Write an enzyme that holds these catalytic residues in place. Structure first.
Site, PDB file in Angstrom:
ATOM      1  N   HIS A  77       0.869  -1.200   0.000  1.00 28.94           N
ATOM      2  CA  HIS A  77       0.000   0.000   0.000  1.00 28.94           C
ATOM      3  C   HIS A  77       0.898   1.240   0.000  1.00 28.94           C
ATOM      4  CE1 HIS A  77       0.248   0.781   4.377  1.00 28.94           C
ATOM      5  NE2 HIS A  77       0.134  -0.540   4.551  1.00 28.94           N
ATOM      6  N   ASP A  79      -0.286   4.373   0.983  1.00 27.34           N
ATOM      7  CA  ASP A  79      -0.703   5.348   2.026  1.00 27.34           C
ATOM      8  C   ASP A  79      -0.040   5.046   3.380  1.00 27.34           C
ATOM      9  OD1 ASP A  79      -2.347   3.055   1.965  1.00 27.34           O
ATOM     10  OD2 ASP A  79      -3.769   4.012   3.359  1.00 27.34           O
ATOM     11  N   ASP A 109       5.949   0.936   7.652  1.00 32.82           N
ATOM     12  CA  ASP A 109       4.587   0.609   7.173  1.00 32.82           C
ATOM     13  C   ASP A 109       4.117   1.584   6.088  1.00 32.82           C
ATOM     14  OD1 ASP A 109       2.144  -0.544   6.920  1.00 32.82           O
ATOM     15  OD2 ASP A 109       1.524  -0.148   9.000  1.00 32.82           O
ATOM     16  N   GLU A 141      -5.101   1.601   2.163  1.00 31.01           N
ATOM     17  CA  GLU A 141      -5.108   0.367   2.996  1.00 31.01           C
ATOM     18  C   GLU A 141      -5.465   0.745   4.439  1.00 31.01           C
ATOM     19  OE1 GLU A 141      -2.863  -0.613   5.691  1.00 31.01           O
ATOM     20  OE2 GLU A 141      -4.045  -2.461   5.989  1.00 31.01           O
ATOM     21  N   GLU A 142      -5.025   1.914   4.903  1.00 29.46           N
ATOM     22  CA  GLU A 142      -5.029   2.256   6.346  1.00 29.46           C
ATOM     23  C   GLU A 142      -6.443   2.686   6.778  1.00 29.46           C
ATOM     24  OE1 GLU A 142      -3.021   1.392   8.496  1.00 29.46           O
ATOM     25  OE2 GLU A 142      -0.927   1.616   7.854  1.00 29.46           O
ATOM     26  N   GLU A 166       3.802  -6.052   4.205  1.00 27.68           N
ATOM     27  CA  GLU A 166       3.542  -5.470   5.553  1.00 27.68           C
ATOM     28  C   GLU A 166       4.672  -5.775   6.544  1.00 27.68           C
ATOM     29  OE1 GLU A 166       1.442  -3.418   6.174  1.00 27.68           O
ATOM     30  OE2 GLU A 166      -0.474  -3.748   5.194  1.00 27.68           O
ATOM     31  N   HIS A 352       2.651   3.112  12.792  1.00 30.46           N
ATOM     32  CA  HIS A 352       1.550   3.935  13.344  1.00 30.46           C
ATOM     33  C   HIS A 352       1.994   4.659  14.616  1.00 30.46           C
ATOM     34  CE1 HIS A 352      -1.808   1.186  11.447  1.00 30.46           C
ATOM     35  NE2 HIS A 352      -0.778   1.409  10.608  1.00 30.46           N
TER      36      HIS A 352
HETATM   37 ZN   LIG Z   1       0.616  -1.493   6.314  1.00 29.12          ZN
END
Ligand SMILES: [Zn+2]
Ligand SMILES: [Cl-]
Ligand SMILES: [Zn+2]
Lengths: 379, 380
Positions: A77, A79, A109, A141-142, A166, A352
């Protein structure tokens, strides 16, 4: 023609691609896609950029080489989550080395994954590959996973296998649970508390429904097992309830929000089957008063068959056994195209989080893992 | 010297006295009480005006003539409910006669009663009563009943008997159910839904509590009886529930708003006892998690002993049998002083409704009835 690894990485981290359901925070992934698109163009891949219906101007990129059936899909992903500028102690968009760590939003990530793919391909001659090689770069994705969803729904592509990059600390991951969210809605009939039997009390009807739902919770916990998960059974949570106007009025409406997390092997249709079955004695007692509506698009359970050749190759290359994880990925949608593993550098301990980083010691093992896997499934 | 009936009524309706829980909307009954106090002074009553503690500048009036044990207490409230800006097709503060109907906010509930008492008292010599006559005018009946609660708590007065002039179409009402409103609150422990065993789900605990409450509902319906009421048992209603943030979080809080309407003769202590014992199995299994808070001042049930002279004479004066009603009045507080009856002109169908009226056909009967009860309970 391809810049060095750290320069590819620096440019990806420096291109904001934050996703957010909140219009204010939601940035287009267009500049991230263009970067990947131009670089994969330079390496000799065909490139398709795809607008994703029902996103704020977001795109997928598929980079393709070779022809005929099978081949390897490498998927990620584009984003990132938002950043807290109050808790970041560096510029989130500035790739910074410090003490064997590379700091930036999406280092772990998962923008690193694309830098490793391109870096690994730098000297590879796509002409001389026996089987096709696909690179998928997905939108959002997030938040909704709208990118991966729309790709698995519309694509003609059918690879031999896929790796989604991931962050797993380069541990191969072969399964996780699904996630369905439902609203249970019960129409009562109003009336004064001076005669509380004259109406249909939605709270009393919801008390019945909750009885049957907790019986389902107990059956799920009792009859479905997957020992590899920390919580080895499908889970059911009552999250929210609201109903009624006043203490002295018959409760005219009641609504319950709940989730279920189905084990990999159980399908969405069978799970909605089990829930309708649990609620059936209640909606039968009361035709037209009980409805079950989806609160959020459902996510199927995911697993890769544990002796699939993808798994044996990866386990052997890394000398690491496959894990299950306690979080949702795009794997459920990519698994409809081909057998899929989740495998990437860096850790969800940084994903995150403020001052997100990827250890530089992941650099050599990751380059080597991608090289070996492209040579295994494309040569 | 007293103005005519229609002037007294006009002034009372012209004097706003809307009560309201919202400080913004809650008008002082000071000016209403003043009209009353002067009129009773003019007729030679001893008058006390008492500020009601904890109210927004509200007052009770007690007008007194005579001394000695017993006597008749005539009671009413000075406050009205608010008027709905959209619905009234005339000025709620202007008393207008249209269709043999007197229109005005509080024409039926219950300012008319005060007009009829003063009008009746025009032709009475208070010096030749053998027992005292008392008129109580209360604050805030439509909200907290603070007026009547304070009066009952503090007065040394013990009349023979009392009539509260609520609108009953001049039918004698001798009983009504109580009203208690509780919030059942449950503190859970939140967590991610990926492991529901890590927390305490307040909705599951509330499912348990409701089970026990519905068993109490059935015990109440079965073990307790009072024939005169349309619903001849103590009722219980689950009116509102809310709790929890999100479908993917363990529900950390749940609250249930319920009411109970006990029969006359069940104390508030008996009822709270029954509810806490219904909730004991949940509350004992989950110490510290389940609380019961009152949403509204609780109101006991009321009844007047059905063979008191008060009932026998009023029944005979009206040629009417006593009735019971579901809804609440100040009677439960007044009844702690003396046998009490609820009896007034105008209909519970106009009470609290746009273009509130009292039918003029009630003027003569109501004046005769008030005259007669003063004669029967003050001359003997
Ligand atoms: Zn991810
Ligand atoms: Cl797990
Ligand atoms: Zn009233």
């Amino acid at each position: 023609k391809l810049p060095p690894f750290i320069e590819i990485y620096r440019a990806l981290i420096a291109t904001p691609s934050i996703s957010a359901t909140e219009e204010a925070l939601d940035q287009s992934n267009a500049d991230l896609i263009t970067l990947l698109a131009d670089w994969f163009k330079d390496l000799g891949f065909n490139v398709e950029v795809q607008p994703v219906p029902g996103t704020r101007n977001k795109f997928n990129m598929l980079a393709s080489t070779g022809q005929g059936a099978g081949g390897l899909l490498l998927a990620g992903h584009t984003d990132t989550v938002p950043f807290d500028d109050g808790r970041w102690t560096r510029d989130p968009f500035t790739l910074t080395e410090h003490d064997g760590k590379l700091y930036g939003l999406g280092t772990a990530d998962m923008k690193g994954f694309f830098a490793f793919i391109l870096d690994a391909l730098r000297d590879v001659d796509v002409t001389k590959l026996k089987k096709p090689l696909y690179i998928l770069a997905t939108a959002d994705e997030e938040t909704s996973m709208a990118g991966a969803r729309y790709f698995a729904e519309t694509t003609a592509l059918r690879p031999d296998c896929a790796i989604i990059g991931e962050p797993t600390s380069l541990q191969p991951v072969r399964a996780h649970k699904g996630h369905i969210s439902n609203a249970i809605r019960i129409q009562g009939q109003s009336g004064h508390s001076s005669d509380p039997a004259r109406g249909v009390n939605a709270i009393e009807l919801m008390h019945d429904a909750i009885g049957h739902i907790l019986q389902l919770r107990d059956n799920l916990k009792e009859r479905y097992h997957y020992e590899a998960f920390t919580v080895p059974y499908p889970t059911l949570n009552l999250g929210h309830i609201h109903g009624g106007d006043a203490s002295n009025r018959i409760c005219a409406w009641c609504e319950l929000h709940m989730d279920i997390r189905p084990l990999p092997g159980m399908t969405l249709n069978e799970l909605n089957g089990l829930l309708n079955d649990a609620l059936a004695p209640v909606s039968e007692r009361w035709p037209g008063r009980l409805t079950v509506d989806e609160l959020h698009p459902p996510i199927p359970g995911y697993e890769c068959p544990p002796n699939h050749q993808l798994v044996e190759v990866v386990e052997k290359l890394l000398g690491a056994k496959t894990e299950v994880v306690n979080y949702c990925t795009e794997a459920p949608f990519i698994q409809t195209l081909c057998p899929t593993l989740v495998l990437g550098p860096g850790s969800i301990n940084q994903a995150h989080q403020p001052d997100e980083y990827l250890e530089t010691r992941f650099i050599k093992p990751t380059r080597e893992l991608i090289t070996q896997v492209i040579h295994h499934f494309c040569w």
